[PDB]
Amino acid sequence: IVGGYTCGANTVPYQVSLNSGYHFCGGSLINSQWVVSAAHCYKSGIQVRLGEDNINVVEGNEQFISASKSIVHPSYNSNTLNNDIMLIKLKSAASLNSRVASISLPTSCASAGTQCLISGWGNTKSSGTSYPDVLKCLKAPILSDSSCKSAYPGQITSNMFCAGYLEGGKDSCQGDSGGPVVCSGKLQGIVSWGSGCAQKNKPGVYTKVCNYVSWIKQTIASN
Ligand SMILES: NCc1csc2ccccc12
Ligand SMILES: [Ca+2]
């Protein structure tokens, strides 16, 4: 997260870290067994880390649970990033408590102008590199479809939205991938892509979660 703030320990209780020896992506806990992330975060050997603040220090609220199954969306295209979503099942159910909690799925799509919370352990600089140990947060609005399309001609599908600031300075970034965009207590986005981070006229692009709720539910119901 570039241009954000320290969230505070365990204040984003659905935020998980995907770990394969190291943090490499965020995700969102959506029930005791299942995590939402980005399909471009797929790999084998994932351990889900819940209850994290400092991802380098064991602070006392973590739960570490290995994935049993990954399901990338059936229509994910890794060239266009269309349908950039996957589900990860945990080998055992997480213990749910104030610091480890699921985030509700949307029952309707959010509109441009809605305020959201984006979070992660990704890069905090727009030039150069610095990775935080504690969770960072950013409040950002959803941008109109038309400004998203004009920012990224030919590349925004109906499964994507832009959020952030056309002026630059505040955005998600590499290592935030797969993490939440939460708006009024519903998971509306997943950190997906952009051109650089926090550049002028290049806002972040996010998977439009409300298009996937019936796929999510039917997948969970059968797996
Ligand atoms: N908002 C931009 C963004 C999000 S994840 C990622 C990974 C690499 C480069 C940019 C980004
Ligand atoms: Ca920790």
202: CATH: 2.40.10.10
For every residue of 143-185, DSSP letters joined together read PPHHHHHHHSTTT--TTEEEES-TT-S-B--TT-TT-EEEETT
End-to-end CA distance of the chain: 33
Q: What is the DSSP letter of 202?
A: B
The answer, yes or no, to whether any atom of ligand 1 lies below 6 A from the CB of 189, is: no
- Is residue 176 located within the same domain as residue 136? yes
- Distance between CA atoms of 130 and 210, rounded to whole angstroms? 32
The answer, yes or no, to whether any atom of ligand 1 lies below 6 A from the CB of 207, is: no
- Is residue 116 located within the same domain as residue 159? yes
Contact 203, 171 (CB under 8 A): yes
Residue 210, number of CB atoms within 10 A of its CB: 17
- Is residue 37 located within the same domain as residue 108? no
Residue nearest atom 8 in ligand 1 by C-alpha distance: 174
Residue 68 appears among annotated catalytic residues: no
- Is residue 142 located within the same domain as residue 95? no
- Distance between CA atoms of 6 and 153, rounded to whole angstroms? 33
| Ligand 1, atom nearest to 204 Cα | 1
Contact 171, 206 (CB under 8 A): no
- Is residue 83 located within the same domain as residue 188? no
- Is residue 165 located within the same domain as residue 133? yes
The answer, yes or no, to whether any atom of ligand 1 lies below 6 A from the CB of 121, is: no
For every residue of 95-144, DSSP letters joined together read PPBTTB-PPBPPSSPPPTT-EEEEEESS---SSS----SS-EEEEEEBPP
130 is in an annotated binding site: no
Residue 176 appears among annotated catalytic residues: no
- Is residue 108 located within the same domain as residue 20? no
Contact 10, 99 (CB under 8 A): yes
Residue 153, number of CB atoms within 10 A of its CB: 7
126 is in an annotated binding site: no
- Is residue 81 located within the same domain as residue 158? no
- Is residue 7 located within the same domain as residue 19? no
Experimental technique for the deposited model: X-ray
| Maximum Cα interatomic distance, the chain, rounded to a whole number of Å | 47
Number of domains making up the chain: 2
> What single letter denotes the amino acid at residue 163?
A
- Distance between CA atoms of 52 and 57, rounded to whole angstroms? 9
Helix (H, G, I), strand (E, B) or coil at 38: coil
Mutate to test the pocket of ligand 1, among 24, 37, 162, 191 (most ligand atoms within 8 A of CB): 191
For every residue of 206-221, DSSP letters joined together read EEEGGGGHHHHHHHHH
Task: Give burial (CB, 10 Å; 0-12/13-18/19+) of 131.
Answer: middle
The domain in which residue 178 lies consists of 1-12+103-210
Distance 196 CA to ligand 1 centre (A): 6
- Is residue 20 located within the same domain as residue 83? yes
Q: What is the number of the ligand closest to the CA of 205?
A: 1
- Is residue 130 located within the same domain as residue 199? yes
- Is residue 113 located within the same domain as residue 196? yes
Q: What is the DSSP letter of 93?
A: P
- Distance between CA atoms of 98 and 70, rounded to whole angstroms? 26
* Cβ contacts of 28 within 8 Å, gap of 6 or more: 14, 15, 16, 35, 36, 37, 103, 179, 180, 182, 187, 190
Name the catalytic one among 17, 102, 177, 192: 177
Task: Give burial (CB, 10 Å; 0-12/13-18/19+) of 145.
Answer: middle
Beta bridge partners of 71: 87
The experimental resolution of this structure, in angstroms, equals 1.2
- Distance between CA atoms of 204 and 198, rounded to whole angstroms? 8
Residue nearest atom 2 in ligand 1 by C-alpha distance: 194
